[PDB]
Symmetry: D2
Subunit: 237 residues, 4 copies
């Protein structure tokens, strides 16, 4: 009854979830255990920047995760998505810190999709950039431990008044308006997500990762979602 499709950014080799023994990534499509994974060297006190994309005539949800002067990590998945999802969708992103804390700060969120096909020569589109995270979005919908208004920062996890992030948050920020990838006439049908994230952790082998999901209109957290359950999979590794 609860569907979703994000791109995993598992920083803790939660190899139990048979996952890669390490900082991988990947395209889970409803089951927490990914379709295609790939290696990714994290970085502390360092800003990250994920990228997604898809095309209707392409069939390939994918991404690549850089760190300036450094390297990054792509990925690609031949998929229809018109399979995975229903005609209307709500897009958000959410992190989870596990047994260990960290800071899943969202720094610069952007989302833009666009439709057309039909030849009717029309194309349509939703898009909004975010850069000045105030305190209350009215337009953003937070869920859990996602507090918002810090400094133009977006925090989807708990963390103190001084500098003390906990290790059990699980939040959920997503765009108030719902998206789409329906329409008859439909031919090609992009969207492109992308965000400057930046995790840190005092400790040496941090848990656990971040995500970016499309999904239900009214998707909600998982009684699961924890750690590896990414805050989006009921659980059932």
């Amino acid at each position: 009854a609860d569907t979703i499709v994000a791109v995993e950014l598992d920083t803790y080799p939660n190899t139990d979830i048979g996952d890669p023994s390490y900082p991988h990534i990947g395209i889970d499509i409803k089951s927490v255990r990914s379709k295609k994974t790939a290696k990714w060297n994290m970085q502390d006190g360092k800003v990250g920047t994920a990228h997604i994309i898809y095309n209707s005539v392409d069939k390939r949800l994918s991404a690549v995760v850089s760190y300036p002067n450094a390297d990054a990590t792509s990925v690609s998945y031949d998929v229809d998505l018109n399979d995975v999802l229903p005609e209307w969708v709500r897009v958000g992103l959410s992190a989870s810190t596990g047994l260990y804390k960290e800071t899943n700060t969202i720094l610069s969120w952007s989302f833009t999709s666009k439709l057309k096909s039909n030849s009717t020569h029309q194309t349509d589109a939703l898009h909004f950039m975010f850069n000045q995270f105030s305190k209350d979005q009215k337009d953003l919908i937070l869920q859990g431990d996602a507090t918002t208004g810090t400094d133009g920062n977006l925090e989807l996890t708990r963390v103190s008044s001084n500098g003390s992030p906990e290790g059990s948050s699980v939040g959920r920020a997503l765009f108030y308006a719902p998206v789409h990838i329906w329409e008859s006439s439909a031919a090609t049908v992009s969207f492109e997500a992308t965000f400057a994230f930046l995790i840190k952790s005092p400790d040496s082998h941090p848990a656990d990762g971040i995500a970016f999901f499309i999904s239900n209109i009214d998707s909600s957290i998982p009684s699961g979602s924890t750690g590896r359950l990414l805050g989006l999979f009921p659980d059932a590794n």
Copy 2:
């Protein structure tokens, strides 16, 4: 209680409420009597595209309508527009009748709101444009006799089956997502719309009009806003 700032495509002069000598688009700030105006040449069975532009800086509320081959019709009005509207503001369109028929028949809808200044310099945007209006809109919000679902079209007013419009309708649609023109850290909030309309009526006086509007978020059809009123105003002038 409910505020609004928005431009009206009057198509029936109503010299009883200050609706001068003939068609006039109007810049209303709560009253059906436009602070500033200019005449209008309602073109039946024709394609015409309204406008509005704003400047944070600048600050000049200025719309424009325009039919093909023929000349357009300008008219603006200088205001502060952050002394009337609230912080976060949701929007759509609407329009009424009350004594004949008409097709407050909409063709396609465009919007964009740019918020900058910050000193982070980067622009926070939301923006969309419909070019296909199918059955139920979802991001949409209808609001009465307005209906969504007849031909990649959007009709705010009432109209029979085979094409026989009634004339005791009102019809309002908004945006599912609250919008946002203020940001503390601001110093240049801009927003721009534009939609094509196409009102028929087989009469020769089809009234009364329509209008491009904004407002609050718990803005609903004013129980008697009709003919004039414009499905906005609470009653009176």
Copy 3:
């Protein structure tokens, strides 16, 4: 010497050069024989909009044509496309005839090229879209029988006065400004076009075709590229 990578709206099967059984759009990488193809249903006196999308990441050259009410025609092709083109690359369109008439008649032109990765994360873009083609274009570049100046229209081919097209024309237009898909600091160069066409010909075999192309910057009409050739290719297959 002159390179090019670009999609062709063949409208005359030429089984002599590998122009199979009927109309086929084609993905050419230097030769008039498309590496990948799919059939086509040339629709005279009709409105149809070609496409092309690319992915830095991804990298899949994939266009699409489409007439209304009716179904579209897909077909893509995976390439690296930064092993063939040069750094800085200028573009436009073109198309030919050589044995009957036709209206390689263009309606409107769209483009956009996004270059990101950087680690500055911010996007370097150029993008434009014509919807009005008046007399002389200026940012434009015509290139033969192609003419600029008959009705917010753009015709790459020859055609008489009152409407009597000849059939020994070629007609190429480009962009006045060199473009740019490579950036050292890159890791996701994207670009997207789309234009509406409208070829007539009162015959029933109007050939030969047209095609969406790129290339070098000192790219000019290949002295004999005609019928097929496509005003690109130097001669031969």
Copy 4:
């Protein structure tokens, strides 16, 4: 024979040019001595960010010049511009350091204009953002002392290999493709420029300012332009 219209950013009260005794700004329209000026507190080793804008139905070229957490400086000028310019235009920006050096580094240049009016429902547009100034633009046209490729920086003035900026440069960077603000049908006709500049100067009372011009297709430097002549006015204070 040489026309141009920029927005002056005179950091040296070159009060001779009867100018404000200080760091003003302003809208010169062919004669170096401004139309409307206004005060502006510079800042060293500090990044600046100018903003322009105009509207066809508005009549108001203007700008505002901020410095985060700080203040800025707007300006506005009721003007047609369809007067000041010809139908086709080339847009650039250029600085000049006078008797004293400084660093007129251009950090983030952006330009976007758009047309439509006509009701033909079409709108057209040019736009490109710049953020990774390599060494040669092919697309940028430099003129004088504008060197380009430093670090993702744009320098329109001389300055050493170690850290030694001279005080006599005069450069000129502008977009290869030409812009426009012609078209019949014309109704409203924006553009919006905007850039993160950042001057510095070891010395206490630096010369002299920066600019941003529209102008000729092939405008060139002034045998003047120096210091206050901004690199765009033949001279004739």
